[PDB]
Design a protein around this ligand. Structure first.
Ligand SMILES: [Cl-]
Ligand SMILES: [Cl-]
Ligand SMILES: [Cl-]
Lengths: 479, 442
């Protein structure tokens, strides 16, 4: 909310060095604070500070004035719309003598029933009047500047990396509350929030959100952040804004700590009742693929199947696209819920369910039930305790089912290893290695053990003959 | 059949199946073609050679219903009839002689859609008003934040150039107020992009130091009637009367005025007192960075000139003049904006600042033009407010100084009216009069 035309900073190499206020700027801070005393027009504050606009930096002077004004309390608006006061009052044209002037004031003051003179220009900021003087110290004015300036540069940020180690849990769901757009990584454990440069229409409200999350990060024992600012019209170029555990930063905005969301808490609830086939976990453990954390909102489970769900705050075409492609290495289905905002026709996706104001558990099911109707390929759970060995045909024989349906649905059991066309308990196989038959032929010795050649083949087997029975040159050997 | 040649307009150009003097084939355009302005002479060519055309060039806007409320003077009526023989060329008169009336009478005669192109925004206001009074029609505007396209339209030279292809074939008549700007390298192309056959030029200074005014015959036409100021020197207001009154400070003001002034006389002289030199002024500024008493020194100097510029006597002098001239509408100019509110609150007259809602400003201006309000205050400091309404008298109070550019605009904005104008300027006889009156600047 501080104007760009008032942002003052410097550039060396690839870093944007902000011209923060120091204690060299206290005489300045004092003289301006001294001027905001009760019963004074701030329009005439602008005339007073002209001489200070010359002796110091005009960007620093005005920026203080705007900040102090914001914390003053003024006479509230007139009971009559000031446009109509002037329309009715100025009807008598030029009136010269004070007694006729005194007549006309009384005349319309009765016609409208209020003190015309005190309110005639109440709507114009020039003709305001300070009732409660600001209570800011000349020193807290300087820290509050250095945060207003800090939040101003960030408002033109490509992205914003927040390096965090201990406060990992809190700042995330607060950002999720605030509805930001971001990618998380695990090499330094950073969060690369998308800066308000990405948004276009509601950027002023997005940047205010990011501005809120910043404030929670500065009020900590140790913190580090890096923002990317894109500067230049004819010759654009990215610069760095690095700042870590900085001192001069005090906020005079109260966020009111609403500490809950209207759509988020309505999501965890609306699903618990209207979709009972699934048993949802509140906050899945953070998945990490390719040194990057992909925090999902919640995971839902229809028995064996488990899918991740994430409801997003702010949307943009490139963000969802980049995310699902990044989550294309998640090895599990996902569903993403997006608030109805500027971005249109963004719900035309496999995971895109675009809500409007709150969570509609109804619309989730039509996809949630579609993903299991689409998984209509018969997979029947089966157990096998090997007598000596388990046969796939045997597993088919017991079940009174054709062999094929088992062959398609082959399952892996922690007990055994699957040599083709059979199973073998890993204890039975580990001992059969100690048997240690070097080479054989004619398949006569296979009958004594009575299993498949598949078991023999895995350890040390080779054959140069396709035929098995009454088949010449059958022989297996180690070499 | 094969006895019809095509002649069409296309994005500022003229296109044709058959050759004509001025055209040149384009493989890119697949026709003989040139810029749109050659439309008039090519049409007459084809017509003279008795060649049948399928003409599609001018897609006119409808010429509206008007009432000609204009009764010209002798030389003015000679001006219209001079242009009418060829319907192309530059009329030349000095300021106030009625260049607008000459044009708007031609408008009433031609009865074709007309675009009127003007250099500045102050001129859009003048032209808009005069088309309402003299033709009883509110014209469309392209410029000044306004985008309306009507049978009669006022437009800037810049918007004209920006939109030339869009509007090239829409107005048969084309007026260029202040035409000497037209030969400039940029507007040269702007002129050529319109197909308009009938084109009028108006100027008091037809001649151009660049020598580029030799482009007139190919862009608008030659000068068709000229009279110098001496050549007629009558039947129009020949100047605006300036009166520069000085008023003395208040008893209570003069006291604090000198005391602060004497506190500087002692301190500034104590260490390096050099004045009226700009380099010395920054010397005090650089010193005041660290010295607490040096900043106070510069504070008092500002406080002294402030007590001068905003002298409550200057307001008291306004009551005298407003009382003593009540024949017609008066417009008070003040550089300062908070000081303008004083004038409003005291005399119960409407104020206009740069931060005034366009809705409000419309009321305060349209009621002024109508004649519900008699006297109005204005403060054109930051957002330069063009001298929107014409009147009989204007008071300027800018004590520290008036931009002669700004000062001269008030003259020309008043000069065009048919009645003599009076311009008062109230300077306080204190620091303002002592420092501003040193250099005459005439
Ligand atoms: Cl050809
Ligand atoms: Cl020449
Ligand atoms: Cl000087």
């Amino acid at each position: 909310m501080l104007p760009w035309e008032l942002a003052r900073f410097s550039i060396v190499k690839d870093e944007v060095l902000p011209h923060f206020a120091t204690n060299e700027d206290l005489d300045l801070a004092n003289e301006i604070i001294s001027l905001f005393k009760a019963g004074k027009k701030l329009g005439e504050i602008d005339e007073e500070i002209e001489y200070l606009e010359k002796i110091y930096d005009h960007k620093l002077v005005r920026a203080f004035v705007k900040l102090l004004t914001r914390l003053c309390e003024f006479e509230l608006d007139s009971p009559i719309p000031p446009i109509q006061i002037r329309r009715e009052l100025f009807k008598y044209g030029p009136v010269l003598d004070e007694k006729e002037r005194e007549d006309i004031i009384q005349k319309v003051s009765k016609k409208l029933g209020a003190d015309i003179m005190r309110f005639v220009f109440s709507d114009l900021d020039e003709e305001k009047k300070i009732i409660k003087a600001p209570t800011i110290s000349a020193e807290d004015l300087i820290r509050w500047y250095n945060l207003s300036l800090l939040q101003t540069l960030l408002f033109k940020a490509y992205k914003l990396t927040v390096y965090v180690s201990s406060n990992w849990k809190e700042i995330i769901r607060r950002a999720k509350w605030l509805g930001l757009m971001y990618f998380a990584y695990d090499k330094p454990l950073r969060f690369e929030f998308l800066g308000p440069a990405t948004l276009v229409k509601l950027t002023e409200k997005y940047g205010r959100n990011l501005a809120v999350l910043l404030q929670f990060i500065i009020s900590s024992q140790n913190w580090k952040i890096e923002a990317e600012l894109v500067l230049g019209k004819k010759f654009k170029r990215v610069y760095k804004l690095k700042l870590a555990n900085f001192k001069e930063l005090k906020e005079l905005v109260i966020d009111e700590k609403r500490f809950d969301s209207s759509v988020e808490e309505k999501f965890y609830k609306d699903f618990t009742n209207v979709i009972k086939g699934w048993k949802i976990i509140r906050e899945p453990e953070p998945l990490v693929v390719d040194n990057r954390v992909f925090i999902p909102d919640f995971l839902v489970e229809k028995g064996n199947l488990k899918v991740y769900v994430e409801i997003v705050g702010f949307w943009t075409k490139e963000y969802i696209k980049e995310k699902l492609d990044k989550l294309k290495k998640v090895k599990y289905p996902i569903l993403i819920l997006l608030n109805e905002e500027l971005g249109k026709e963004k719900f035309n996706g496999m995971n895109v369910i675009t809500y409007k104001r709150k969570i509609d558990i109804s619309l989730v099911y039509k996809w949630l039930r579609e993903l299991e109707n689409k998984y209509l390929n018969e997979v029947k759970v089966d157990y096998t305790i090997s007598g000596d060995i388990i046969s796939l045909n045997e597993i088919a024989s017991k079940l009174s089912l054709p062999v094929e349906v088992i062959r398609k649905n082959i399952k892996i059991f922690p007990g055994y290893i699957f040599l083709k066309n059979y199973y073998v308990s890993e204890k039975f196989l580990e001992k059969l290695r100690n048997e240690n038959f070097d080479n054989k032929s004619l398949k006569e010795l296979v009958s004594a053990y009575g299993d498949y050649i598949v078991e023999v083949l895995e350890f040390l087997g080779y054959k140069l003959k396709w035929q098995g029975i009454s088949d010449a040159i059958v022989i297996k050997d180690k070499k | 059949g094969s006895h019809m040649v095509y002649l069409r307009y296309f994005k500022g150009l003229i296109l044709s199946d058959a050759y004509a003097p001025g055209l040149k084939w384009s493989d890119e355009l697949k026709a003989y073609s040139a810029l749109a302005f050659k439309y008039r002479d090519v049409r007459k060519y084809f017509l003279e050679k008795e060649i049948e055309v399928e003409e599609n060039v001018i897609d006119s806007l409808p010429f509206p219903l008007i009432k000609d409320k204009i009764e010209l003077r002798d030389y003015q009526a000679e001006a219209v009839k001079a242009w009418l023989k060829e319907k192309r060329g530059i009329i030349v008169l000095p300021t106030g002689a009625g260049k607008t009336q000459v044009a708007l009478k031609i408008v009433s005669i031609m009865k074709v859609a007309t675009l009127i192109v003007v250099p500045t925004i102050d001129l859009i206001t003048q032209w808009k008003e005069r088309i309402n009074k003299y033709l009883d029609f509110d014209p469309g505007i392209i410029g000044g934040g306004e985008d309306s396209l009507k049978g009669i339209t006022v437009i800037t030279y810049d918007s004209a150039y920006t939109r030339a292809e869009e509007l090239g074939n829409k107005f048969p008549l084309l007026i260029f107020d202040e035409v000497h700007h037209l030969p400039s390298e940029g507007y040269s192309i702007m002129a050529q992009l319109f197909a308009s056959p009938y084109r009028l030029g108006l100027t008091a200074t037809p001649e151009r130091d660049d020598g580029k005014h030799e482009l007139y015959p190919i862009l608008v036409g030659p000068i068709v009637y000229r009279k110098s100021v001496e050549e007629l020197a009558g039947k129009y207001i020949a100047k605006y009367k300036i009166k520069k009154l000085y008023v003395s400070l208040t008893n209570e003001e003069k006291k604090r005025y000198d005391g602060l002034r004497k506190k500087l006389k002692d301190f500034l002289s104590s260490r390096g007192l050099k004045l009226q030199n700009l380099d010395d002024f920054h010397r005090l500024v650089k010193l005041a960075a660290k010295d607490k008493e040096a900043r106070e020194a510069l504070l008092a100097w500002h406080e002294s000139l402030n007590i001068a510029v905003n002298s409550q006597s200057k307001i008291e002098k306004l009551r005298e003049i407003l009382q003593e001239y009540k024949n017609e509408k008066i417009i008070v100019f003040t550089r300062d904006t908070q000081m303008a509110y004083r004038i409003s609150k005291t005399f119960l007259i409407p104020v206009v600042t740069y931060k005034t809602d366009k809705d409000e400003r419309e009321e305060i201006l349209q009621k002024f033009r109508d004649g519900e309000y008699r006297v109005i205050v204005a403060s054109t400091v930051f957002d330069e407010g063009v001298d929107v309404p014409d009147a009989t008298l204007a008071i300027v109070m800018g004590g520290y100084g008036t931009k002669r550019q700004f000062l001269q605009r008030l003259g020309r904005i008043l000069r065009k009216k048919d009645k003599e104008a009076l311009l008062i300027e109230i300077v306080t006889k204190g620091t303002a009069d002592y420092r501003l009156s040193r250099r005459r600047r005439e």
